[PDB]
Design a protein around this ligand. Structure first.
Ligand SMILES: CC[C@@H]1C[C@H](C)CC/C=C\[C@@H]2C[C@@]2(C(=O)NS(=O)(=O)C2(C)CC2)NC(=O)[C@@H]2C[C@@H](Oc3nccc4cc(OC)c(F)cc34)CN2C(=O)[C@H]1NC(=O)OC(C)(C)C(F)(F)F
Ligand SMILES: CC[C@@H]1C[C@H](C)CC/C=C\[C@@H]2C[C@@]2(C(=O)NS(=O)(=O)C2(C)CC2)NC(=O)[C@@H]2C[C@@H](Oc3nccc4cc(OC)c(F)cc34)CN2C(=O)[C@H]1NC(=O)OC(C)(C)C(F)(F)F
Ligand SMILES: CC[C@@H]1C[C@H](C)CC/C=C\[C@@H]2C[C@@]2(C(=O)NS(=O)(=O)C2(C)CC2)NC(=O)[C@@H]2C[C@@H](Oc3nccc4cc(OC)c(F)cc34)CN2C(=O)[C@H]1NC(=O)OC(C)(C)C(F)(F)F
Ligand SMILES: CC[C@@H]1C[C@H](C)CC/C=C\[C@@H]2C[C@@]2(C(=O)NS(=O)(=O)C2(C)CC2)NC(=O)[C@@H]2C[C@@H](Oc3nccc4cc(OC)c(F)cc34)CN2C(=O)[C@H]1NC(=O)OC(C)(C)C(F)(F)F
Ligand SMILES: [Zn+2]
Ligand SMILES: [Zn+2]
Ligand SMILES: [Zn+2]
Ligand SMILES: [Zn+2]
Lengths: 193, 193, 193, 193
């Protein structure tokens, strides 16, 4: 098994969020095996991939978090070679690596707001009403293709702070009505499992 | 000068560590003066307090260990009244009392692992790369307030064995970059100061 | 993508349940490629495999039912070539093919019993107390390895009727304490998705 | 929290250093509460005290410097009421107030001398060989009691110029073998923490 590769990024700093590709199919193949990635890293959300899957990863408090169902126990490619996981929990579906040099960490939310915004891999930032610790209902139901590939992405408060990590979607006939996420308070309190 | 009192504990059994409060400021002030504590004790990591300071204490091999800079020469409040220290060393900054009945002891690490996890008073479990015999660097540096009050707490290995006791932080720019700790092998080998 | 292949089965006819291997890693690869499998079929529960994963499949009312997270949109290998799916529902994590000739089908439960039994790929048939329509608690909590590769397997009532199809395990620190299943009343009522 | 109070001084003017007490426990307690101290100030090294601790404070370039581990963020009692700190750094363990009227400031050393002299609260002037920027070894090792209550005190060169402020002692078996100090070049260059 190879390393997880940063193949793009979601820029959240301007008036309009945008996704940008940094690596194609050809570039991602040898980067995965060597674990060496010389590409300059920028932003809060990275678009990441393995050999069979594409998903997101979010830098919060100097840690780049993602889902175990995407990254497995894999390292991530960096300029100084493959980077091992700081956090690994299969039961929570969570992994984390030291945030890459040049990345911009989101700050954890203490607002207690129920007005959330989910960031997708297509840079859509959509409202989610918080319905519990790890649940949120979408204000507008979406087809599965709209959310697929966006696990490991963040849930933000109206002030742009990180509230959680997108894990799973509540679905009915190819349509998502709610989301399941790992709350920010459950990140650095994670035990190895 | 009163006793050190157990005011809470860190629960390490789940996928998420959590802090539990067992006593408020009034009961801590009181129990500190009398040294009598009838409360059910559980787990490995205790949250402890004197009349003026709060820190951690860790059970390893039937001994509850902590820092001298926190506990001084003080007794520990217990069901049978104040319990005197079995280990006291000002130079090492270490103290220990017989572990409270019902407490669970961590087993010392026999891994040789250099991937450590520091447990804070806020139930944060942060990765530390073992650098020296008594040193480790944070994989992701943290503000002081994040590590403050966590002296006497444990440095665990990936398997959850004890590797050392948190003593001091290597701070620059109001940020802890590295930690200083008493290694497990240096605990039972302690002489009286 | 190739076909789903029967690689063995779970015989529940006698006093003691037993698993039998009928195909190996090479034969499974060749059968996945051709979609033609002339091997004899017998029993309720089939041990099935793709090129990368292995799980269970249960015949209920002439349909061989399994999980989408295992089978995907894949056809099943048969003596007359690749068999296309009759039920495909991503949201329910359910797939179904016409049961292969030689298979025995379970009958749906109408007993109303809350005393369930889950059948594993290792032929263990373990008690599960029903909590809701799709949930049950394990009477003995189990390591993840004990249940992994058993999705698509059945939940039985004390009279041996089909109660549901094992889908997911409620896990904490590598231990499953409860199970999530697709109830029998949710099988034939399934829509395409 | 009350004021840090001058409770005496070290006279370094004759052939033999001496310590003079100017206030007793009752006066220090009353002067700490009001923050008003009408007493005459003389010399370079003051004996200072809070409600609980006693230590030293040294005037260098019109600033009375001491350790944060003794003074904290506290004001100093003066003829015109409480005087606030102009220098406060937890990381360096340094504080500084405007030197009191009547104090005599030491001048920073520019000898480059490696032969230092540490001044204790008991007026002992003991040789220290400089080893690095912030370290010196004792020519004759000492019991801890000899050095305790002398943080904030000066390290002088053979010519009587200020080289550093005494911070910590390198201790083994109730004996100090070396000293850790804040160099004079690190005093005015101090940023707030
Ligand atoms: C069946 C409906 C859902 C799957 C759809 C096909 C996809 C929905 C779209 C996006 C989802 C965020 C999105 C995505 O984007 N993934 S991705 O980037 O594409 C991928 C595969 C890595 C490359 N996640 C999924 O598809 C996930 C993957 C799978 O669930 C899980 N697997 C493993 C461990 C989990 C642990 C959990 O709790 C501890 C847990 F809640 C779910 C776990 C399954 N999963 C889901 O999101 C599924 N929803 C789901 O399982 O929901 C439940 C039952 C957990 C619910 F309703 F309670 F939340
Ligand atoms: C100045 C920067 C540090 C203080 C910050 C204000 C706080 C850092 C946060 C947490 C530290 C673990 C934390 C905490 O949490 N404490 S607490 O629970 O709050 C408390 C006071 C009991 C109630 N410990 C400290 O703050 C400690 C206390 C003080 O150092 C020491 N005092 C006494 C004896 C020591 C003996 C030693 O070796 C033989 C030693 F290395 C340090 C000793 C001081 N101390 C420290 O941690 C300090 N770091 C420090 O002294 O570092 C050195 C110089 C020893 C280093 F860099 F080499 F490691
Ligand atoms: C995180 C802990 C669980 C994963 C462990 C690593 C393994 C547990 C062991 C056995 C589970 C039955 C076992 C197995 O055997 N699989 S297998 O045969 O090995 C395989 C991969 C096909 C070859 N299933 C899993 O591992 C499943 C796979 C994954 O969940 C799911 N993915 C896709 C769609 C799902 C739709 C759902 O509802 C509509 C749903 F509830 C779960 C879905 C993930 N999954 C799970 O069982 C996970 N539990 C889980 O997701 O549970 C929740 C959150 C739905 C719970 F707790 F609410 F039930
Ligand atoms: C464990 C041995 C030492 C404590 C002994 C019980 C006493 C030694 C005697 C005198 C020391 C100068 C004497 C004294 O006199 N103090 S006092 O006037 O009594 C007081 C408490 C204010 C009222 N200072 C101490 O006791 C000091 C206090 C404590 O260390 C420290 N706390 C806070 C911040 C520090 C920052 C540092 O660097 C960034 C640092 F190196 C040490 C820090 C702790 N401290 C020390 O001097 C301790 N030594 C120590 O921490 O040494 C190290 C590990 C930093 C060393 F060896 F590297 F220098
Ligand atoms: Zn917020
Ligand atoms: Zn270990
Ligand atoms: Zn029945
Ligand atoms: Zn000089």
């Amino acid at each position: 098994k190879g390393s997880v590769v940063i193949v793009g990024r979601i820029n959240l700093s301007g008036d309009t969020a945008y996704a940008q590709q940094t690596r194609g199919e050809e570039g991602c193949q040898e980067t995965s095996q060597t674990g060496r990635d010389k590409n300059q890293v920028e932003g809060e959300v990275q678009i990441v991939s393995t050999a069979t899957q594409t998903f997101l990863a979010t830098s919060i408090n100097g840690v780049l978090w993602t889902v175990y169902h995407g990254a497995g126990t894999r390292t991530i490619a960096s300029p100084k070679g493959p980077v091992t996981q700081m956090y690994t929990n299969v039961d929570k579906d969570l992994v984390g690596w030291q945030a890459p040099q040049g990345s911009r960490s989101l700050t954890p939310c203490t607002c207690g707001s129920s007005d959330l915004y989910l960031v997708t891999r297509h840079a859509d930032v959509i409202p989610v009403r918080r319905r519990g610790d790890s649940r949120g209902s979408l204000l507008s139901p979406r087809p599965i293709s709209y959310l697929k590939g966006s696990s490991g992405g963040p849930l933000l408060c109206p002030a742009g702070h990180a509230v959680g990590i997108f894990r799973a979607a509540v679905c009915t006939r190819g349509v998502a009505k709610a989301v399941d996420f790992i709350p920010v308070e459950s990140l650095e309190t994670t035990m190895r499992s």
